Amino acid sequence: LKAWHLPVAPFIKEQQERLMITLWLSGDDLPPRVTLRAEEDNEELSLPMHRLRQAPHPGVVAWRGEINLVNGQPRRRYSFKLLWADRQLWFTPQEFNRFPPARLEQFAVDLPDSGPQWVADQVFYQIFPDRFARSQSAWDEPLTAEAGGSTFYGGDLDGISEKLPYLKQLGVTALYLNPVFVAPSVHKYDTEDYRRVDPQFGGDAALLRLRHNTQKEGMRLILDGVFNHSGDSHAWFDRHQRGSGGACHNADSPWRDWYNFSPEGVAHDWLGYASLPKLDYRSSTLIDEIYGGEDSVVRHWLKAPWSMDGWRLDVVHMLGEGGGARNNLRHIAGITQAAKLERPDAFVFGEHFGDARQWLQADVEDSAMNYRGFTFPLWGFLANTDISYDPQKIDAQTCMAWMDNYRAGLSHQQQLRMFNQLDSHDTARFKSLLGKDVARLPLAVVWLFSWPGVPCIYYGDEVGVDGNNDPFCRKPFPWDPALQDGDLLDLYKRMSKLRKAHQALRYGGCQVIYAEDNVVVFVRVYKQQRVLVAINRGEACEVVIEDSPLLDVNGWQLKEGAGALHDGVLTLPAISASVWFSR
Amino acid sequence: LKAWHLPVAPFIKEQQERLMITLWLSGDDLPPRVTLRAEEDNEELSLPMHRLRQAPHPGVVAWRGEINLVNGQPRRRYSFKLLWADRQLWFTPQEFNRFPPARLEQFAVDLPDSGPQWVADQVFYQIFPDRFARSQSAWDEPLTAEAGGSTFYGGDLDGISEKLPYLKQLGVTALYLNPVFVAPSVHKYDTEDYRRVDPQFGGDAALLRLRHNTQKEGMRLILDGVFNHSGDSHAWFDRHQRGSGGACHNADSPWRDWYNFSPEGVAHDWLGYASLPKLDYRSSTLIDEIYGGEDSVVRHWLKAPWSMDGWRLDVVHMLGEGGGARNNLRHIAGITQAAKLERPDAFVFGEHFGDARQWLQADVEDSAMNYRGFTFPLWGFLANTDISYDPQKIDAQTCMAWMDNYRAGLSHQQQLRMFNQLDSHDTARFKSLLGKDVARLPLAVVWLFSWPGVPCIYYGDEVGVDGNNDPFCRKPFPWDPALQDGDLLDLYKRMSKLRKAHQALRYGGCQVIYAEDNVVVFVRVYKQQRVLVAINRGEACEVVIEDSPLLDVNGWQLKEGAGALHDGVLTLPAISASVWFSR
């Protein structure tokens, strides 16, 4: 018995106030009835399906049902209940299930979709401001472990402005900046003033120019939002009594209850770092200052003249009351809600090194840095390591069971805006993590642009910057092309063009077709278009692709890599990734 | 490779401000390191484990780690990360995992536990008031389909009071009553007045007496709370203009915005029943009336003189704003929070025919009617049917994968207070659902008292009342012992005594030991005590129980059923359930 469904055309179609759902089956003992299990206002519904007269593909029986759209919440969850005379079988995002699927692991489509619909059309680039580019108004000194992280190399926002032509050439359409607000460090997560841009990066005037220049170049701009904790030099806290009524040293301070102090008097902070005291969101004035008020920090940078496109929320998972994460979900929801009040299409996403599904499944934020659903699966399958740099021996089966299990908790629209990257300012460079297997790096780059989600390049990844974890992953960008991997740069350029060109790489469903040992093969699917991606992490090999109605096309045009598809046989060279378009 | 862990002593121990966690392993290629993955304030933690010198059981290596308890939220989630030189393996509530488990499917223990700790010590009994017993101040007429459901047979609350000796003999310690407030129907979910008890059931005076009599007999009392919708005869709505300013027929009504009326003017209601208009929780006055105010309905019946022990929340999953379930989780949380303000140990649980995990995993309620986690697994494995009375062919493997998958989303303390029952006033009688397989009924009864959770008898189940779905599952209770299955009655009596006697049936962990085809075997585990339960749904058979360190005891004393355990061989008669205690 076989089944196919993806939460996208040609399988679904909105028509008047109805969502038409289509399921494909094939086999010797086909169920005489199929129930479409849908949900309206959390109530499970048994909607009957009827067999269509016309076979969509050779040997394929199609069933159709309908979800009434006038009632219910925007997120439409559903799955398929196959019924024989004596038994039942569920069809789900994770294949067949002998017992009912989790409600939160069904197929799901957001109709109406109130999310930030521009995110799926973007190529993102993350910039650590000090290490990217100096404006026109020493840079090669090697980063050390003692000093690296306290050393300013002097990049600024005008430097970013001046490099916009390079970033457009690369294919970038959106910037995510690390913290830019006034703060004593080079990274600036120890916020001193949420209202002013640090002069070291060019101050307010330079961020105004960057907003203008990105606007003019059609590029989005996201700022790093640090609200779990403040800096210990902030006027609110003020470790060093640079002011009169700080919270650290005055019981009568207007902000004494914006922090939690123990019975002994030690402030609660972030993972033991005393320069990052944690903000106590029990206090209703702190709530008004961060997101509740009309000119709260969250809304301030989203209205004119700043008009930023959204927020990356630092340490999103620990923000809360009383020195810990109590009432975290409510407060992240409040931040996101405040952001959308100011700008309805604001993109709000959270830093989640761990499992973000509970946050995303309650819709408290649009998206997450997809470390669990994308990054660490690739670290393990490709680089034999993981978040703790513990050894990892997982094959294609396991890698794709993992990636597909995570996605299953997410609607199609949520999947398309997940923030996928290979590394960041808080990890070792992926190129370094590969060690002797560095030839696998182009495979990751292709995967990054073809897996559902929006891709984000970590600055310098594209020209082959390497290095170990913080501080060594914050190397200065090498603008000397003699220090640049130009072949790798071109791969990023070509992939962003493939993604810009083909709707299925931005809007399409995703079906893993083959996942065994060293080879992953999946197809993106949108209307009549198909994009096939074959990844081979090991020696050269041949693989048989079973006749599949998802691949029933006029023909295949190879677009990247040296793989070859003929009569259902994929010939894959050693350590390769290939992409085909259907013609 | 083998592993054992249950979220209970002897595997965990609280000591000063530390939670000691112990893992057992056994095999030829044991990991040289084990990391205890724990979580503090949603931040994943790598806590190292150390090998204990003393083997807890033959051939078993024990690892130990610690969770610091002074920081973090009460719910302590954790799992085990086994590390070799080249690879890792996760150990979880659902056995071994090759990729990381879901955060919300780890082991979990609530320390401190602020839940209603009395629930785990209870045996519940659900009474449909009209059909249970008439007070001392016709009953055999068969229920029909035309009239049944509009016919009053005349049971009342004094009848319940008068039958308390019978219920104590049965082993009952807690009552769950169906709606008792003023309303025109026999079932009374069409609430007319939340402040008064319907005279047909004996009025306010009779519920006062029942509260006194249950108090005096050491019994808990839960009322049915109907807050998703009101009755259409309520003064707030008032379909029939029995008052001056109802919402249905007055745009200026003080409660016009407590309901949602379409552009055409049709009120939103429950699943198309016009006598149950849905309450619009966008309105801040409705919120104050139901749970926000000091004398809101939710708190009213929890303080003196009523002092009820909690609330069963009808249609908990659809309550919300705007005619649907928008902001449902916030409002259920508000109801529960209001209840605990009035009585800190109030038991609040929701009617969930579907998957309740998102509600329970956000702690918006203490528990749920465990239809998904308990009832429907038994309907399928034992009676070949399911919630829709669709055929079901699942074996022991599938049945236990299903039951253990659901539990995995729940902490140990949550599992112990899940509201388990075999049927209710909204289902066919389980005895009828068995059809020709009615000999399996005693198996379900044993299972109901030995699976983690609090058991709830549906009135009359214990003497063999049968019947089909609503209205035929609301037969009058047969007080004529000639119409009573006395053998079945005695089984309930003995099981409640086993549960009252043995801590592991109330507080213990649960490990499925064998689940193949027709046989399920599991053990409840608490400190040094063990309760072994073997269920055989088919013909008589013998089953080998592998040597297991969970079963390494002084000896086994058979307590119920005719099964026999000797030298690791279970001899199980056809269609039987057996229970042993460790001595």
Ligand SMILES: OC[C@H]1O[C@H](O)[C@H](O)[C@@H](O)[C@@H]1O
């Ligand atoms: O938010 C974390 C930031 O501060 C931390 O202390 C790290 O050491 C630093 O590298 C990082 O930029």
Ligand SMILES: OC[C@H]1O[C@H](O)[C@H](O)[C@@H](O)[C@@H]1O
């Ligand atoms: O809440 C549901 C109640 O009303 C429904 O209309 C049913 O028909 C009735 O049997 C039940 O008691």
